[PDB]
Structure formats: structure tokens, C-alpha cells
Design a protein around this ligand. Structure first.
Ligand SMILES: [Zn+2]
Length: 258
């Protein structure tokens, strides 16, 4: 029926409705650190989020998205392996039912408790909907979360989750600064891949940061309280909303560091 993360509609079944699921440039992947090529021609990333305007937080039934005003160049990513400017449209997370799983990308097969994705679209395409149809349409920053100390900048998000508990609920969410979600270092790995949920389009330049951020146990515990279902439907906790690692195929992972 419609895709999700259960036993009957889970990632193993997606190919039946989205044949691109078995494509040549599918994400996520395992990052083999000893095989990644250091590329000294990669520039440092440029993150300009000082003019970011968050607007709303929504439970879409598969994750929660915080959405930003992308009608102008307010929060952009450039540099790194990118050509052109990419505007932040939304961020969301992937997490697990236990601390030992939850991330989509893995490092030398190590899984993290969660993974943050900051989604940006290439301005040359005029809108998000046009950008997903292009090989260089999106740039996604992936950030791993490990359980340790609390991340102060994530608490505003944690606190509003009670109000978007079930699918379709949304809440006003203004004045949130995504700078509070970045690690100290911007060292990264990069490769060409896709969206990790249907429609699985192969339009993404992935930028995965080497340094994880820490969250407390209680912070991630609040994520696990969300629901996949709509209000008044039987309760299914929103956990394990992560796609397993896909074959690298003909692709090289490049590192911005050695
Ligand atoms: Zn994602």
C-alpha cells in the first residue's frame, strides 16, 4: 500500500512502486574511510544561515520537517564540491528505536543514533520541484548524532514535538537558528546520490560531515514519542525511519580532509 518503514511497506518493498530504488546512484551508502580519496581541489564549504527564516514544523507521517522561507537567498550553502548557490528549504532527522541505530549513512559500518539532513535546492532551477529533476539539483548536508551531552540548540525543536504528535499536524516555528545544529568542524565526505525516501530521485550531491554532534538520551527519547499515524488511528511510534546502506556501484567517495 503506501510506503513506510514497516515490515509490509518498508525499504525492501519500495522498488515495486519506485523502480529507481535499484538505480546506480542510490543513497545512503557505507563510507569506507580507508577508500575515500582525499581531493585537495575541494573547497571549504560556505554555510550562510545568519538570515535564516524558519516558518513551521510539520509531522508528514515519515519524519518531522522544520521549513524555511526559500523565496530569496536568505540561508544558502555554496562552495565545497558545489557550483552555484543552494537555498535551504527544510531540515529533518532519521532515528532509531535504540541508540545503536538510526543513521542512514554509516562510517566503516558504524551506525549513529540519528542523522540530520539539511536540504538545499540549486537556485538556477527556480524552484524545488524543478531542482529534483536535475542531477545537480539538490545539496544535502548530513550530520550524525551520537548520545552524550545535550545539544542546547536542539531543545526548541524537542519542546514542540508534543504539538505535532501525529501525521498532518503542523505548528508555527519562527525564529529557529539552524547554526545551533552544526558541529565545530566542517570537514566532510562527498558523493553523488539520491533522496533517501520515495521518490528516490538521483538529484543529490551529498555532503556528510565527519564530526557528529551530541544529543542527550532524553532529547532523542522525545523523537521516539512521535507517531507515524494520523490522529484517532491506532498508535504506531515513529522510530527506525531510516533506509539501509545501498551499493556504491560506480561511485567514488571524496574527502575534504586527510
Ligand atoms: Zn533525510
Amino acid at each position: 500500500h503506501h510506503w513506510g518503514y514497516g515490515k509490509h511497506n518498508g525499504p525492501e518493498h519500495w522498488h515495486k512502486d519506485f523502480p529507481i530504488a535499484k538505480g546506480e546512484r542510490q543513497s545512503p551508502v557505507d563510507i569506507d574511510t580507508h577508500t575515500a580519496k582525499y581531493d585537495p581541489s575541494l573547497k571549504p564549504l560556505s554555510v550562510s544561515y545568519d538570515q535564516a527564516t524558519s516558518l513551521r514544523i510539520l509531522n508528514n507521517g515519515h519524519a518531522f520537517n522544520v521549513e524555511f522561507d526559500d523565496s530569496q537567498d536568505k540561508a544558502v550553502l555554496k562552495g565545497g564540491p558545489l557550483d552555484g548557490t543552494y537555498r535551504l528549504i527544510q531540515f529533518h532527522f532519521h532515528w532509531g528505536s535504540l541508540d545503536g541505530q538510526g543513521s542512514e549513512h554509516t562510517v566503516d559500518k558504524k551506525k549513529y543514533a540519528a542523522e540530520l539532513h539539511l536540504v538545499h535546492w540549486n537556485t538556477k532551477y527556480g524552484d524545488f520541484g524543478k531542482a529534483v529533476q536535475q542531477p545537480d539539483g539538490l545539496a544535502v548536508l548530513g550530520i550524525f548524532l551520537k548520545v552524550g551531552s545535550a545539544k542546547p540548540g536542539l531543545q526548541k525543536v524537542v519542546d514542540v514535538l508534543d504539538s505535532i504528535k501525529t501525521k498532518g499536524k503542523s505548528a508555527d516555528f519562527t525564529n529557529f537558528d539552524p547554526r545551533g545544529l552544526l558541529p565545530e568542524s566542517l570537514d566532510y565526505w562527498t558523493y553523488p546520490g539520491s533522496l533517501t525516501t520515495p521518490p528516490l530521485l538521483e538529484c543529490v550531491t551529498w555532503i556528510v560531515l565527519k564530526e557528529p554532534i551530541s544529543v542527550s538520551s532524553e532529547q532523542v527519547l522525545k523523537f521516539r514519542k512521535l507517531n507515524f499515524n494520523g490522529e484517532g488511528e491506532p498508535e504506531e511510534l515513529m522510530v527506525d525511519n531510516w533506509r539501509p546502506a545501498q551499493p556504491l556501484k560506480n561511485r567514488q567517495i571524496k574527502a575534504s580532509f586527510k
